[PDB]
Nucleic acid binder design. Structure first.
Ligand SMILES: [Mg+2]
Ligand SMILES: [Mg+2]
Ligand SMILES: [Mg+2]
Ligand SMILES: [Mg+2]
Ligand SMILES: [Mg+2]
Ligand SMILES: [Mg+2]
Ligand SMILES: [Mg+2]
Ligand SMILES: [Mg+2]
Ligand SMILES: [Mg+2]
Ligand SMILES: [Mg+2]
Ligand SMILES: [Mg+2]
Ligand SMILES: [Mg+2]
Ligand SMILES: [Mg+2]
Ligand SMILES: [Mg+2]
Ligand SMILES: [Mg+2]
Ligand SMILES: [Mg+2]
Ligand SMILES: [Mg+2]
Ligand SMILES: [Mg+2]
Ligand SMILES: [Mg+2]
Ligand SMILES: [Mg+2]
Ligand SMILES: [Mg+2]
Ligand SMILES: [Mg+2]
Ligand SMILES: [Mg+2]
Ligand SMILES: [Mg+2]
Ligand SMILES: [Mg+2]
Ligand SMILES: [Mg+2]
Ligand SMILES: [Mg+2]
Ligand SMILES: [Mg+2]
Ligand SMILES: [Mg+2]
Ligand SMILES: [Mg+2]
Ligand SMILES: [Mg+2]
Ligand SMILES: [Mg+2]
Ligand SMILES: [Mg+2]
Ligand SMILES: [Mg+2]
Ligand SMILES: [Mg+2]
Ligand SMILES: [Mg+2]
Ligand SMILES: [Mg+2]
Ligand SMILES: [Mg+2]
Ligand SMILES: [Mg+2]
Ligand SMILES: [Mg+2]
Ligand SMILES: [Mg+2]
Ligand SMILES: [Mg+2]
Ligand SMILES: [Mg+2]
Ligand SMILES: [Mg+2]
Ligand SMILES: [Mg+2]
Ligand SMILES: [Mg+2]
Ligand SMILES: [Mg+2]
Ligand SMILES: [Mg+2]
Ligand SMILES: [Mg+2]
Ligand SMILES: [Mg+2]
Ligand SMILES: [Mg+2]
Ligand SMILES: [Mg+2]
Ligand SMILES: [Mg+2]
Ligand SMILES: [Mg+2]
Ligand SMILES: [Mg+2]
Ligand SMILES: [Mg+2]
Ligand SMILES: [Mg+2]
Ligand SMILES: [Mg+2]
Ligand SMILES: [Mg+2]
Ligand SMILES: [Mg+2]
Ligand SMILES: [Mg+2]
Ligand SMILES: [Mg+2]
Ligand SMILES: [Mg+2]
Ligand SMILES: [Mg+2]
Ligand SMILES: [Mg+2]
Ligand SMILES: [Mg+2]
Ligand SMILES: [Mg+2]
Ligand SMILES: [Mg+2]
Ligand SMILES: [Mg+2]
Ligand SMILES: [Mg+2]
Ligand SMILES: [Mg+2]
Ligand SMILES: [Mg+2]
Ligand SMILES: [Mg+2]
Ligand SMILES: [Mg+2]
Ligand SMILES: [Mg+2]
Ligand SMILES: [Mg+2]
Ligand SMILES: [Mg+2]
Ligand SMILES: [Mg+2]
Ligand SMILES: [Mg+2]
Ligand SMILES: [Mg+2]
Ligand SMILES: [Mg+2]
Ligand SMILES: [Mg+2]
Ligand SMILES: [Mg+2]
Ligand SMILES: [Mg+2]
Ligand SMILES: [Mg+2]
Ligand SMILES: [Mg+2]
Ligand SMILES: [Mg+2]
Ligand SMILES: [Mg+2]
Ligand SMILES: [Mg+2]
Ligand SMILES: [Mg+2]
Ligand SMILES: [Mg+2]
Ligand SMILES: [Mg+2]
Ligand SMILES: [Mg+2]
Ligand SMILES: [Mg+2]
Ligand SMILES: [Mg+2]
Ligand SMILES: [Mg+2]
Ligand SMILES: [Mg+2]
Ligand SMILES: [Mg+2]
Ligand SMILES: [Mg+2]
Ligand SMILES: [Mg+2]
Ligand SMILES: [Mg+2]
Ligand SMILES: [Mg+2]
Ligand SMILES: [Mg+2]
Ligand SMILES: [Mg+2]
Ligand SMILES: [Mg+2]
Ligand SMILES: [Mg+2]
Ligand SMILES: [Mg+2]
Ligand SMILES: [Mg+2]
Ligand SMILES: [Mg+2]
Ligand SMILES: [Mg+2]
Ligand SMILES: [Mg+2]
Ligand SMILES: [Mg+2]
Ligand SMILES: [Mg+2]
Ligand SMILES: [Mg+2]
Ligand SMILES: [Mg+2]
Ligand SMILES: [Mg+2]
Ligand SMILES: [Mg+2]
Ligand SMILES: [Mg+2]
Ligand SMILES: [Mg+2]
Ligand SMILES: [Mg+2]
Ligand SMILES: [Mg+2]
Ligand SMILES: [Mg+2]
Ligand SMILES: [Mg+2]
Ligand SMILES: [Mg+2]
Ligand SMILES: [Mg+2]
Ligand SMILES: [Mg+2]
Ligand SMILES: [Mg+2]
Ligand SMILES: [Mg+2]
Ligand SMILES: [Mg+2]
Ligand SMILES: [Mg+2]
Ligand SMILES: [Mg+2]
Ligand SMILES: [Mg+2]
Ligand SMILES: [Mg+2]
Ligand SMILES: [Mg+2]
Ligand SMILES: [Mg+2]
Ligand SMILES: [Mg+2]
Ligand SMILES: [Mg+2]
Ligand SMILES: [Mg+2]
Ligand SMILES: [Mg+2]
Ligand SMILES: [Mg+2]
Ligand SMILES: [Mg+2]
Ligand SMILES: [Mg+2]
Ligand SMILES: [Mg+2]
Ligand SMILES: [Mg+2]
Ligand SMILES: [Mg+2]
Ligand SMILES: [Mg+2]
Ligand SMILES: [Mg+2]
Ligand SMILES: [Mg+2]
Ligand SMILES: [Mg+2]
Ligand SMILES: [Mg+2]
Ligand SMILES: [Mg+2]
Ligand SMILES: [Mg+2]
Ligand SMILES: [Mg+2]
Ligand SMILES: [Mg+2]
Ligand SMILES: [Mg+2]
Ligand SMILES: [Mg+2]
Ligand SMILES: [Mg+2]
Ligand SMILES: [Mg+2]
Ligand SMILES: [Mg+2]
Ligand SMILES: [Mg+2]
Ligand SMILES: [Mg+2]
Ligand SMILES: [Mg+2]
Ligand SMILES: [Mg+2]
Ligand SMILES: [Mg+2]
Ligand SMILES: [Mg+2]
Ligand SMILES: [Mg+2]
Ligand SMILES: [Mg+2]
Ligand SMILES: [Mg+2]
Ligand SMILES: [Mg+2]
Ligand SMILES: [Mg+2]
Ligand SMILES: [Mg+2]
Ligand SMILES: [Mg+2]
Ligand SMILES: [Mg+2]
Ligand SMILES: [Mg+2]
Ligand SMILES: [Mg+2]
Ligand SMILES: [Mg+2]
Ligand SMILES: [Mg+2]
Ligand SMILES: [Mg+2]
Ligand SMILES: [Mg+2]
Ligand SMILES: [Mg+2]
Ligand SMILES: [Mg+2]
Ligand SMILES: [Mg+2]
Ligand SMILES: [Mg+2]
Ligand SMILES: [Mg+2]
Ligand SMILES: [Mg+2]
Ligand SMILES: [Mg+2]
Ligand SMILES: [Mg+2]
Ligand SMILES: [Mg+2]
Ligand SMILES: [Mg+2]
Ligand SMILES: [Mg+2]
Ligand SMILES: [Mg+2]
Ligand SMILES: [Mg+2]
Ligand SMILES: [Mg+2]
Ligand SMILES: [Mg+2]
Ligand SMILES: [Mg+2]
Ligand SMILES: [Mg+2]
Ligand SMILES: [Mg+2]
Ligand SMILES: [Mg+2]
Ligand SMILES: [Mg+2]
Ligand SMILES: [Mg+2]
Ligand SMILES: [Mg+2]
Ligand SMILES: [Mg+2]
Ligand SMILES: [Mg+2]
Ligand SMILES: [Mg+2]
Ligand SMILES: [Mg+2]
Ligand SMILES: [Mg+2]
Ligand SMILES: [Mg+2]
Ligand SMILES: [Mg+2]
Ligand SMILES: [Mg+2]
Ligand SMILES: [Mg+2]
Ligand SMILES: [Mg+2]
Ligand SMILES: [Mg+2]
Ligand SMILES: [Mg+2]
Ligand SMILES: [Mg+2]
Ligand SMILES: [Mg+2]
Ligand SMILES: [Mg+2]
Ligand SMILES: [Mg+2]
Ligand SMILES: [Mg+2]
Ligand SMILES: [Mg+2]
Ligand SMILES: [Mg+2]
Ligand SMILES: [Mg+2]
Ligand SMILES: [Mg+2]
Ligand SMILES: [Mg+2]
Ligand SMILES: [Mg+2]
Ligand SMILES: [Mg+2]
Ligand SMILES: [Mg+2]
Ligand SMILES: [Mg+2]
Ligand SMILES: [Mg+2]
Ligand SMILES: [Mg+2]
Ligand SMILES: [Mg+2]
Ligand SMILES: [Mg+2]
Ligand SMILES: [Mg+2]
Ligand SMILES: [Mg+2]
Ligand SMILES: [Mg+2]
Ligand SMILES: [Mg+2]
Ligand SMILES: [Mg+2]
Ligand SMILES: [Mg+2]
Ligand SMILES: [Mg+2]
Ligand SMILES: [Mg+2]
Ligand SMILES: [Mg+2]
Ligand SMILES: [Mg+2]
Ligand SMILES: [Mg+2]
Ligand SMILES: [Mg+2]
Ligand SMILES: [Mg+2]
Ligand SMILES: [Mg+2]
Ligand SMILES: [Mg+2]
Ligand SMILES: [Mg+2]
Ligand SMILES: [Mg+2]
Ligand SMILES: [Mg+2]
Ligand SMILES: [Mg+2]
Ligand SMILES: [Mg+2]
Ligand SMILES: [Mg+2]
Ligand SMILES: [Mg+2]
Lengths: 121, 129
RNA sequence: GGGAGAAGGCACGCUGAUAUGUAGGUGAGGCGACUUGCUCGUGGAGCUGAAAUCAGUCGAAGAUACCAGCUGGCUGCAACUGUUUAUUAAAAACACAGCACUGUGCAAACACGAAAGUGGACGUAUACGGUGUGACGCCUGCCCGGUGCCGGGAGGUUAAU
RNA sequence: UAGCUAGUAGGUGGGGUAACGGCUCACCUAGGCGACGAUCCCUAGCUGGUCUGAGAGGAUGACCAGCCACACUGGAACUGAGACACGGUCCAGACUCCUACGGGAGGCAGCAGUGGGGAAUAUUGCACAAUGGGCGCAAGCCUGAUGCAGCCAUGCCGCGUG
RNA sequence: CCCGCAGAAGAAGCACCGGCUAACUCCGUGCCAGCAGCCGCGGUAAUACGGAGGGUGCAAGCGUUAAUCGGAAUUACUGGGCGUAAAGCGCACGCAGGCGGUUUGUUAAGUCAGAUGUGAAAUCCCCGGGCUCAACCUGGGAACUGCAUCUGAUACUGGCAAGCUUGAGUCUCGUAGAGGGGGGUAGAAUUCCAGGUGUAGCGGUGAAAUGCGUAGAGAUCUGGAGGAAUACCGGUGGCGAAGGCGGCCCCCUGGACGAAGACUGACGCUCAGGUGCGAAAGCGUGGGGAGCAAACAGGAUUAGAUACCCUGGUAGUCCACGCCGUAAACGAUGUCGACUUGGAGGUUGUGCCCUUGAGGCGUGGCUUCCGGAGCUAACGCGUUAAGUCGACCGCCUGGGGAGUACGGCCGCAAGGUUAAAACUCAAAUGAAUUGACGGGGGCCCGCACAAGCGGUGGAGCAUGUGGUUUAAUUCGAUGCAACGCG
RNA sequence: GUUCCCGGGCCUUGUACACACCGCCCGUCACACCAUGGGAGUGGGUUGCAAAAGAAGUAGGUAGCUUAACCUUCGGGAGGGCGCUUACCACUUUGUGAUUCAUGACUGGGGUGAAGUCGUAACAAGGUAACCGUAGGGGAACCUGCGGUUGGAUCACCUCCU
RNA sequence: ACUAUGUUCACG
């Protein structure tokens, strides 16, 4: 406030940081993948959530959630990563794209198959 | 410490109307009389005087139609901290043209309606609803 | 304050020129004058003379000889200059400024001395002696059972007489 | 990031520039910029616009058009009306290159295309028929400029699928 | 582009269906598997998971991801705030800067009006036109919010000359005050020191003990030494910018307020950097040290007690000279000015009548409390505003990370000051409301306690549970409110 | 007989409780993961200063070697070209800083994680009111001193007064 | 006088 104060120091616009550091406004990104493993979520949930560390191509080292029931990911295996938090595993802030590269489609799925990368019956 | 005298006039008018007060004394000036006469001429104030030789005291006489006051709202626009000069076509119209904006134009102080027809702009002193 | 000559660089000879030797130093024959002078203040003839810049020029090399720092980084110990085993040890040892405890009221404590007397001191507690520690910065914790020291005086034991 | 700055800031005179100018010299003066942000650091081609918004604004600058900049990296000039010259020249460099070992090449940020990078983005097509461009009296020759074609639901829009 | 056959023939997916948000059932699964844009779904009757049917929404596309704006008045110029939610620097002085009472001039910088040039074309926009239609192309128009110059206008703002008196300041005269700085001295008390009296305790506590005492303490009296603090007066009293400031007396000294004049003639208000002051605790050096008292020791308490309680007790607390620069430095409320109903006090002035008897009306300063309009999320504030406006400054932008790190600046140090980011959460927060609770308060009541009386718990047996055993020892009840219970 | 123990009733008050005190809740310690500062250092990027360097070219100077037109006394003048040379200067070299990004034994805190350990600091007078500053102490919340704030509770137990 | 604690998610 005070118009003279604003002339002397203008309104600093709140530069809101991005949720997902995949960098340079990229839709998806390749990941070599290391340590595929299970993890427990926060309070009201309780499960064994399937998740992997992902050595990204640009240099970053991120965890990514593995959606669907069952997966082919292990040790290495090159996968594709898209954005999206899980909101349960604190730290996990990406999703593996099912269908793309070494990550295969979910077995025996019918409804909602673009998500989970499965072809027609 | 008394930076804007014109705003102080318009508060005395606003605060006189809130208190249901008959008359409103204050130190006079050239620009005070010009504004006070425009408010009278259209009909927010009911008469005024400028009694005094050495130390003049301009007192107004506020209008009341019902129990409610006549001056609904009155505010300073072109304050000394931020002067607001509008052009001919960019002149405002208060309350969609049933209130007035006192505007100091090159041909004396006048209403915004008169400034449009006269064909000129100026410093918009105050909106009066 | 330093470190610091940190590190590391560049320029250096000779010959002309600027300048028939310069700024500078320097002061004479003069001339005011002021008086009696080993005079004041001009005055600047000669001698003297850097340091530069510019242009040449020779050599492989110009601070050419003698003379005359090796430098930087990490780290222990001791703050420092100093002292020390004359004649195998120079140091981290001693000392040191600074710090604490302690004694000492002046015929001071203490020391040398059978003593007289001397130093301490022709000083007097902001002084003096002893002990430890050892600039400076941050600090210096618990134990008084044992050994010492200090204070207390009832009681026990206790010499000479 | 609080001080930067010695051709630095101005003068006189000489040279040089198509043109004026510390453009560049010699001397002279001691400035100049700086809290209305110099200097230093990081980032960035700029605009018409584009998207968004009630508007103010916010974000952005692919395609079309104007300006600038650059041409393997670092320099220099020559030629010319125009360049300190994408497909000139000369050095130097890194990397590919062929040789008879003496020495030579070479420059896709023109068009196709390859490897590599990437989440990701196309044919080693046809044609000067038009529209400009180049030279030439012209005819014409030249032209990956342009006009077509390929590819891709990448969009906007039409008709399907009775 | 036009006809010519041919035959529905070759030509439909994929999101979603718990709320936001258009659309529901059934099986499978059982906090698993999984979903998730936000809230959240799944623990054996899932509308949210997986499948199935059914629906809904788009359809040669659909969804997911990323990216920008929007909604976000969540950086607020249009258009937000700062008593308690995030947010008034601890308080002053003050240069640059922002703002400035009032009347004449006078310019024309701002401002306003007009005019001319330009603001490339495309794009956008509107009326047309052309492709079967559309997208697309396209004619004209408007626009290009601008910038420049040129001529005017003088209200306002500025510059510039005089003013002028309301602001602001000076002088005269008094009044009040723990304003300050320096120096004296007074009495009460506490402690220790010396002595007299005197005979077992004193001291302390919830209860004890450590501690002091037959060496004669405690108590009592006399004389003395110290140091620190000033009973009563003393108040919702006063003074100070804030921090803060109390015995009494002098020395120097700053301000405040009133009275009626005279003078100056806007000299003013704010203030980034900057400087000054700034409780307590610390820190340095030199003193001082009664009481008190971090640390520390012992004794209790306790499961433990590095605490609370007790007995001791050093730095410190005190003075001189420097440093520190912070506090819930608080009215949690920046400074200055104007304006807008009241009431009850306190405090300090000053005028007019009769002091005609501790009177009475008035008008000023400072101040405590309760309330009106109005404001506020509410609580509340309310002429000393958080009301109504103006000037300027400081600050805020979800909670954690963090007033932390790094770097600067300052500091002897302690540390102060300036001040991030990654990461992480969907909250954190304020006021008020209804309950419930409290080792909060009041008032009652009940075999609740007291006042009694007889029992259980000891024994043996009956019965019921737990357990253990068993082929089975069916099943249920399992704090009061299950256990001679169904 | 009503002070206390237990339960209940009404009123008032504080509350960080609403599964409503059998409530909430703080910090160490233990484990896992993530980001993050310090750290003997190590490995780059950029870049300041101080020099050395000097290829090509351009210009200035020219003892040397030349040489078509102009002038000519038919001798040669002029002028030019090469070579040399000086200046300007690129590559490159040396030293030393600055800054910035990686990385590093170990280490300091920080965040997150359904049912770990130790206590119970806070919210009620939270059982010693809480909190702010500061100093000392302590396994941990914290405790203690000094000053400050109310964002503390009860102020029918005293007893005696207006 | 002193006098500690109440595993997790839920049901409203
Ligand atoms: Mg879990
Ligand atoms: Mg206009
Ligand atoms: Mg030095
Ligand atoms: Mg060294
Ligand atoms: Mg020196
Ligand atoms: Mg040297
Ligand atoms: Mg040297
Ligand atoms: Mg050295
Ligand atoms: Mg020599
Ligand atoms: Mg010479
Ligand atoms: Mg001479
Ligand atoms: Mg001379
Ligand atoms: Mg001389
Ligand atoms: Mg003579
Ligand atoms: Mg001479
Ligand atoms: Mg002379
Ligand atoms: Mg001579
Ligand atoms: Mg030379
Ligand atoms: Mg030479
Ligand atoms: Mg020789
Ligand atoms: Mg030579
Ligand atoms: Mg040499
Ligand atoms: Mg030598
Ligand atoms: Mg030497
Ligand atoms: Mg070391
Ligand atoms: Mg060693
Ligand atoms: Mg070692
Ligand atoms: Mg050492
Ligand atoms: Mg030594
Ligand atoms: Mg030492
Ligand atoms: Mg020696
Ligand atoms: Mg000796
Ligand atoms: Mg010796
Ligand atoms: Mg020896
Ligand atoms: Mg010997
Ligand atoms: Mg030695
Ligand atoms: Mg020796
Ligand atoms: Mg020493
Ligand atoms: Mg003798
Ligand atoms: Mg003797
Ligand atoms: Mg003697
Ligand atoms: Mg003597
Ligand atoms: Mg002594
Ligand atoms: Mg020694
Ligand atoms: Mg020693
Ligand atoms: Mg020391
Ligand atoms: Mg010290
Ligand atoms: Mg003893
Ligand atoms: Mg003794
Ligand atoms: Mg003794
Ligand atoms: Mg003794
Ligand atoms: Mg030309
Ligand atoms: Mg120029
Ligand atoms: Mg639009
Ligand atoms: Mg719109
Ligand atoms: Mg909007
Ligand atoms: Mg831009
Ligand atoms: Mg492009
Ligand atoms: Mg194209
Ligand atoms: Mg093009
Ligand atoms: Mg141009
Ligand atoms: Mg140009
Ligand atoms: Mg170039
Ligand atoms: Mg170019
Ligand atoms: Mg190229
Ligand atoms: Mg080229
Ligand atoms: Mg080139
Ligand atoms: Mg080049
Ligand atoms: Mg030609
Ligand atoms: Mg040219
Ligand atoms: Mg070319
Ligand atoms: Mg090419
Ligand atoms: Mg080559
Ligand atoms: Mg190409
Ligand atoms: Mg390719
Ligand atoms: Mg042909
Ligand atoms: Mg053509
Ligand atoms: Mg031609
Ligand atoms: Mg022709
Ligand atoms: Mg013809
Ligand atoms: Mg042709
Ligand atoms: Mg061709
Ligand atoms: Mg083309
Ligand atoms: Mg399509
Ligand atoms: Mg298509
Ligand atoms: Mg596709
Ligand atoms: Mg047809
Ligand atoms: Mg047919
Ligand atoms: Mg048919
Ligand atoms: Mg048929
Ligand atoms: Mg079909
Ligand atoms: Mg399970
Ligand atoms: Mg169920
Ligand atoms: Mg079901
Ligand atoms: Mg479903
Ligand atoms: Mg369906
Ligand atoms: Mg799409
Ligand atoms: Mg947005
Ligand atoms: Mg906005
Ligand atoms: Mg605003
Ligand atoms: Mg807000
Ligand atoms: Mg708060
Ligand atoms: Mg707050
Ligand atoms: Mg404040
Ligand atoms: Mg304040
Ligand atoms: Mg501030
Ligand atoms: Mg000022
Ligand atoms: Mg002004
Ligand atoms: Mg004015
Ligand atoms: Mg005025
Ligand atoms: Mg005029
Ligand atoms: Mg003007
Ligand atoms: Mg203008
Ligand atoms: Mg105009
Ligand atoms: Mg246009
Ligand atoms: Mg149209
Ligand atoms: Mg048509
Ligand atoms: Mg049409
Ligand atoms: Mg269009
Ligand atoms: Mg058109
Ligand atoms: Mg047009
Ligand atoms: Mg037009
Ligand atoms: Mg006029
Ligand atoms: Mg005028
Ligand atoms: Mg004027
Ligand atoms: Mg006075
Ligand atoms: Mg007075
Ligand atoms: Mg006083
Ligand atoms: Mg007084
Ligand atoms: Mg007093
Ligand atoms: Mg006083
Ligand atoms: Mg005083
Ligand atoms: Mg006084
Ligand atoms: Mg005592
Ligand atoms: Mg006695
Ligand atoms: Mg006794
Ligand atoms: Mg006694
Ligand atoms: Mg006694
Ligand atoms: Mg006495
Ligand atoms: Mg004493
Ligand atoms: Mg005394
Ligand atoms: Mg005292
Ligand atoms: Mg005051
Ligand atoms: Mg006051
Ligand atoms: Mg006081
Ligand atoms: Mg006193
Ligand atoms: Mg005074
Ligand atoms: Mg005064
Ligand atoms: Mg005064
Ligand atoms: Mg007065
Ligand atoms: Mg007057
Ligand atoms: Mg006057
Ligand atoms: Mg300030
Ligand atoms: Mg100070
Ligand atoms: Mg003080
Ligand atoms: Mg103090
Ligand atoms: Mg200390
Ligand atoms: Mg002290
Ligand atoms: Mg010291
Ligand atoms: Mg000291
Ligand atoms: Mg002391
Ligand atoms: Mg003492
Ligand atoms: Mg004991
Ligand atoms: Mg204890
Ligand atoms: Mg206990
Ligand atoms: Mg136990
Ligand atoms: Mg114990
Ligand atoms: Mg005590
Ligand atoms: Mg003491
Ligand atoms: Mg004193
Ligand atoms: Mg301060
Ligand atoms: Mg200070
Ligand atoms: Mg503070
Ligand atoms: Mg205070
Ligand atoms: Mg207060
Ligand atoms: Mg505050
Ligand atoms: Mg205020
Ligand atoms: Mg003030
Ligand atoms: Mg002020
Ligand atoms: Mg006011
Ligand atoms: Mg006021
Ligand atoms: Mg009143
Ligand atoms: Mg009163
Ligand atoms: Mg009130
Ligand atoms: Mg009033
Ligand atoms: Mg009032
Ligand atoms: Mg009042
Ligand atoms: Mg007032
Ligand atoms: Mg206010
Ligand atoms: Mg408010
Ligand atoms: Mg302020
Ligand atoms: Mg700020
Ligand atoms: Mg912020
Ligand atoms: Mg944050
Ligand atoms: Mg703090
Ligand atoms: Mg800090
Ligand atoms: Mg640091
Ligand atoms: Mg410093
Ligand atoms: Mg200092
Ligand atoms: Mg320092
Ligand atoms: Mg210290
Ligand atoms: Mg300390
Ligand atoms: Mg609350
Ligand atoms: Mg509250
Ligand atoms: Mg109760
Ligand atoms: Mg009983
Ligand atoms: Mg009985
Ligand atoms: Mg019995
Ligand atoms: Mg019986
Ligand atoms: Mg029995
Ligand atoms: Mg029993
Ligand atoms: Mg029995
Ligand atoms: Mg049974
Ligand atoms: Mg049984
Ligand atoms: Mg059963
Ligand atoms: Mg019952
Ligand atoms: Mg039951
Ligand atoms: Mg029964
Ligand atoms: Mg009860
Ligand atoms: Mg009842
Ligand atoms: Mg009630
Ligand atoms: Mg409370
Ligand atoms: Mg709750
Ligand atoms: Mg509890
Ligand atoms: Mg802790
Ligand atoms: Mg923590
Ligand atoms: Mg780290
Ligand atoms: Mg690190
Ligand atoms: Mg490092
Ligand atoms: Mg050179
Ligand atoms: Mg060369
Ligand atoms: Mg020839
Ligand atoms: Mg010839
Ligand atoms: Mg010839
Ligand atoms: Mg020649
Ligand atoms: Mg480690
Ligand atoms: Mg380790
Ligand atoms: Mg356990
Ligand atoms: Mg335990
Ligand atoms: Mg507690
Ligand atoms: Mg506590
Ligand atoms: Mg309590
Ligand atoms: Mg307790
Ligand atoms: Mg407590
Ligand atoms: Mg409390
Ligand atoms: Mg504290
Ligand atoms: Mg502290
Ligand atoms: Mg502490
Ligand atoms: Mg400690
Ligand atoms: Mg321990
Ligand atoms: Mg303690
Ligand atoms: Mg306290
Ligand atoms: Mg526990």
């Amino acid at each position: 406030a005070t118009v003279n104060q604003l002339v002397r120091k203008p309104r600093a616009r709140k530069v809101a940081k991005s949720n997902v550091p995949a960098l340079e406004a990229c839709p998806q990104k390749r990941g070599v993948c290391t340590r595929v493993y299970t993890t427990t979520p926060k309070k009201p949930n309780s499960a064994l959530r399937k998740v992997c560390r992902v050595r990204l191509t640009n240099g970053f080292e991120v965890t990514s959630y593995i959606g669907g029931e069952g997966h082919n990911l292990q040790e290495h295996s090159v996968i594709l990563i898209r954005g999206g938090r899980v909101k349960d595993l604190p730290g996990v802030r990406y999703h593996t794209v099912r269908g793309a590269l070494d990550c295969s489609g979910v077995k025996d799925r019918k409804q909602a198959r673009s998500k989970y990368g499965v072809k027609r019956p | 410490s008394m930076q804007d005298p014109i705003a102080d006039m318009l508060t005395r008018i606003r605060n006189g109307q809130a208190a249901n007060k008959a008359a409103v004394t204050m130190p006079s000036s050239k620009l005070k009389v010009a504004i006070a006469n425009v408010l009278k001429e259209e009909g927010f104030i009911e008469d005024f005087k400028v009694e005094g030789d050495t130390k003049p005291e301009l007192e107004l006489t506020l209008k009341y139609f019902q129990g409610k006051a006549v001056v609904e709202s009155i505010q300073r626009v072109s304050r000394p901290g931020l002067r607001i000069y509008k052009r001919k076509d960019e002149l405002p119209k208060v309350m969609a043209g049933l209130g007035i904006a006192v505007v100091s134009t090159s041909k004396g102080v006048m209403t915004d309606r008169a400034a449009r027809q006269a064909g000129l702009g100026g410093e918009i002193i105050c909106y009066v609803a």
